[PDB]
RNA sequence: ACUCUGGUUUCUCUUCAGAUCGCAUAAAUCUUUCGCCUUUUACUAAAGAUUUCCGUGGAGAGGAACAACUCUGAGUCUUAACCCAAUUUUUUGAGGCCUUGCUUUGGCAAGGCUA
């Protein structure tokens, strides 16, 4: 967690890089199907 | 304004289930793909097909229990005060006769008499 992921490849900035215990699920705001412009 | 009809609850079982069985929502298996991947599970998430589970409705049967009683249905679903009535029914003067012509007599049609 002290790495600063922001500088990391984008196949690198995932959760448990390497091990068979992965999901699709990313993060938060790329789940967020909201936008801020509509309604 | 009347005669004949006649319940509700609850338990269990056997079947049929289209229906939003379900105005709710789980899991497993298989076949495709999907993300990891280091070995099995345990997994990621989409489709299709199966099941399983928590439930449900309809019908039939057998019990226990307010069962002894209405209600519902069917049936024409009963009568005298005040009206005897002046265009299609059962209290409405519309009633008859002959002549003429036709017709085998019978019978049919127009006319007159009309209190």
Redesign the pocket.
Known sequence: DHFNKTILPK?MQ?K??????????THLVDQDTTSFDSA
Request: charged share 25%.
């Open positions: 196949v995932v448990n890089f390497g091990r068979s215990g992965r999901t699709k699920y």
